[PDB]
Amino acid sequence: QSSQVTKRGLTDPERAAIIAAAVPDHALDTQRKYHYFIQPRWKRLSEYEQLSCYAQPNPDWIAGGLDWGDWTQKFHGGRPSWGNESTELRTTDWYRHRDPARRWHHPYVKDKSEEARYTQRFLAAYSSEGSIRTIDPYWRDEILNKYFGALLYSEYGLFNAHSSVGRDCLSDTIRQTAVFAALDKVDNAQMIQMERLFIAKLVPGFDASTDVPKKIWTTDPIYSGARATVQEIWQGVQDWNEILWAGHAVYDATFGQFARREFFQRLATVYGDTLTPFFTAQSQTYFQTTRGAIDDLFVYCLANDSEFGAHNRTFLNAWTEHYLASSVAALKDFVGLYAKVEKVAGATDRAGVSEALQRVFGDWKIDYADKIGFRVDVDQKVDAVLAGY
């Protein structure tokens, strides 16, 4: 070959001997803990903190930064690479957030890969089982195909709301939390379409194209409030804290949890759908992992920041007021879908829907509203939604 075949210093006798002569017989320092100066959140420094913390090169004029001076190159006009102008919220240290699941990149893809491969094994067995035969064909072709299919656009819209968050946010652990939350949302959208494509292989003339779901998302009154909230959260604001809080802690925690768990998953297990709960098992698992990290960022940290907690709750309560109204509106449109399904006592009758809304709103009050001082009357929100029943 035209070029030298390079001898390896690890195994070549000559080069290994030269290298051995140059290496000292003793260590030159005894501190072997990588970035030993990070303050640990738990009893001892974790690998997640070691590999993540301070990768963002913030200067001292962004709260928590270790570097100094201005950026080397800014936007035309002077916008800084990162800057305090990116959000209303304030903190003594932007690096204080910790994902409680401690996900750096490797555990994240390791877990999703398990779900990736197991899903295909489950589908091959489910097709061989013939279990599709017991699904109510009205639920299948009318509710599932059309209205579950349209829900992918909510997930996809929430995914896209993270694009400016991923560019604008101000530390490394926050950025990892946001990007993983975004991928899980687009995963949810792709899984809903995977289910529809799967059903198309088993039921002839089942149409898995997105044409009808897209028409329903964009023009059906049942999704009109949801589409409006999602378009606003995605393209109407750029404060990256507002997007994460509105997206996950209000809209997805109220409308999203109702649509995924109280409607499509719960009623799958009254109309004999043995397939859909396999997919909602994933979206709901992703929802609870995301919630742990959003909770740490907003509830545990920013709402209690030693200098800015009350300042921050002022904005959080304002945002919550505005986006909770949008989400109530979205749920009030959505519950019209119940007119399209068979009335089952305690599930799809008014008492059933009322209990389901008490679960979503009552959970949200404990999980989020109580912890930032937001006052909410659960019963009053339940009644506002039932107005659309």
Partner 1 sequence: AKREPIHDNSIRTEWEAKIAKLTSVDQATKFIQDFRLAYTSPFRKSYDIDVDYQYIERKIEEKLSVLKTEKLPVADLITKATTGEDAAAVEATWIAKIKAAKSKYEAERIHIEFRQLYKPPVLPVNVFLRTDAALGTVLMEIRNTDYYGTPLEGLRKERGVKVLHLQ
Partner 2 sequence: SAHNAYNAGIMQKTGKAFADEFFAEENQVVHESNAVVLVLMKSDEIDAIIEDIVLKGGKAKNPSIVVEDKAGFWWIKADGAIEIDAAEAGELLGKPFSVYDLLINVSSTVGRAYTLGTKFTITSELMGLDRALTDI
Partner 3 sequence: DALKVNRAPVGVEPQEVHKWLQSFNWDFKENRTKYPTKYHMANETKEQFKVIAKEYARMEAAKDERQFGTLLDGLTRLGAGNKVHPRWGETMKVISNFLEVGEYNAIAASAMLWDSATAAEQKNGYLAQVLDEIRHTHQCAFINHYYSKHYHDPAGHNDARRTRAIGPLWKGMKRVFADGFISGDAVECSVNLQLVGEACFTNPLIVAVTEWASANGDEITPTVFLSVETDELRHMANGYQTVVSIANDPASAKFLNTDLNNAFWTQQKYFTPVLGYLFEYGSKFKVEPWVKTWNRWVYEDWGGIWIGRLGKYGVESPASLRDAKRDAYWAHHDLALAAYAMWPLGFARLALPDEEDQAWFEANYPGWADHYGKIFNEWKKLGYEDPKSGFIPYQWLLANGHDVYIDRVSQVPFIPSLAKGTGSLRVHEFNGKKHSLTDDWGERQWLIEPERYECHNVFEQYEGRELSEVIAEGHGVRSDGKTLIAQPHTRGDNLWTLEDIKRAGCVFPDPLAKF
Which residues here bind partner 2, judged by CB under 8 A? 1-3, 5-6, 8, 43-50
Residues in region 349-378 near partner 3 by CB under 8 A: 355, 358-359, 362-363
**Contact, 249 vs 298, CB < 8 A?**
yes
Nearer to partner 1, 263 or 315 (CB): 315
- Identify the residue among 84, 92, 142, 197 touching partner 3 (CB under 8 A): 197
Give 67's DSSP letter: B
Binding-site partner at residue 386 among a copy of itself, partner 3, partner 2, none, CB < 5 to 8 Å by type: none
Question: If we measure between CA atoms, which residue out of 92, 138, 385, 127 comes closest to residue 262?
Answer: 385
Least distance from partner 2 to the Cβ atom of residue 200, Å: 15
Using CA atoms, how far residue 54 sits from 60, 68, 135, in Å, is 12, 14, 52
- Identify the residue among 38, 51, 59, 146 touching partner 1 (CB under 8 A): 59
Residues in region 9-28 near partner 1 by CB under 8 A: none
Determine the Cα–Cα distance for residues 91 and 98; give it in Å rounded to an integer.
15
Report the helix count and the strand count for the chain, using DSSP H and E: 16, 0
Binding-site partner at residue 162 among partner 3, a copy of itself, partner 2, none, CB < 5 to 8 Å by type: partner 3
When asked if residue 281 is in the footprint of a copy of itself (CB under 8 A), the reply is yes
- Binding piece for partner 1, criterion CB under 8 A, among 21-29, 79-87, 336-344, 348-356: 79-87
**Contact, 255 vs 360, CB < 8 A?**
no
When asked if residue 343 is in the footprint of partner 3 (CB under 8 A), the reply is no
Helix residue ranges per DSSP H, 4-104: 13-22, 47-52
Which residues touch 146 (CB under 8 Å, ≥6 apart)? Answer: 212, 213, 216
Binding-site partner at residue 56 among partner 3, partner 2, partner 1, none, CB < 5 to 8 Å by type: partner 3
Binding-site partner at residue 45 among partner 3, a copy of itself, partner 2, none, CB < 5 to 8 Å by type: partner 2
The dihedral sign for the CA sequence 46, 52, 57, 59:
negative
Binding-site partner at residue 88 among partner 3, partner 1, a copy of itself, none, CB < 5 to 8 Å by type: partner 1
CA atoms within 13 A on the CB side of 298: 33
Least distance from a copy of itself to the Cβ atom of residue 388, Å: 22
Least distance from a copy of itself to the Cβ atom of residue 292, Å: 9
Least distance from partner 1 to the Cβ atom of residue 303, Å: 13
Determine the Cα–Cα distance for residues 323 and 318; give it in Å rounded to an integer.
9
Determine the Cα–Cα distance for residues 342 and 346; give it in Å rounded to an integer.
12
Contacts 24+ apart (CB under 8 A), 212-217: 212/145, 212/146, 212/149, 213/145, 213/146, 213/149, 213/150, 213/152, 213/153, 214/150, 214/153, 216/146, 216/147, 216/149, 216/150, 217/150, 217/153, 217/154
Which token pair is 101? Answer: 């699941």
Least distance from partner 3 to the Cβ atom of residue 176, Å: 6
When asked if residue 384 is in the footprint of a copy of itself (CB under 8 A), the reply is no
Binding-site partner at residue 84 among partner 2, partner 3, a copy of itself, none, CB < 5 to 8 Å by type: none
When asked if residue 87 is in the footprint of partner 1 (CB under 8 A), the reply is yes
Determine the Cα–Cα distance for residues 285 and 91; give it in Å rounded to an integer.
30
When asked if residue 95 is in the footprint of partner 1 (CB under 8 A), the reply is no
Q: Could you report how far apart the first and last alpha carbons of the chain are, in Å?
A: 77
- Identify the residue among 177, 265, 312, 327 touching a copy of itself (CB under 8 A): 265
Nearer to a copy of itself, 12 or 370 (CB): 12
User: Which three-class secondary structure state does DSSP give residue 236?
Assistant: coil
Binding-site partner at residue 224 among a copy of itself, partner 3, partner 1, none, CB < 5 to 8 Å by type: none
Binding site for partner 1 (CB under 8 A): 59-63, 68-70, 75-79, 84-88, 90, 236-239, 242, 307-308, 310-311, 314-315, 318
Binding site for a copy of itself (CB under 8 A): 10-14, 16-17, 20, 111, 113-115, 117-118, 121-122, 124-126, 128-131, 133-134, 261, 265-266, 268-274, 277-278, 281, 284-285, 287-289, 291, 347, 359, 363
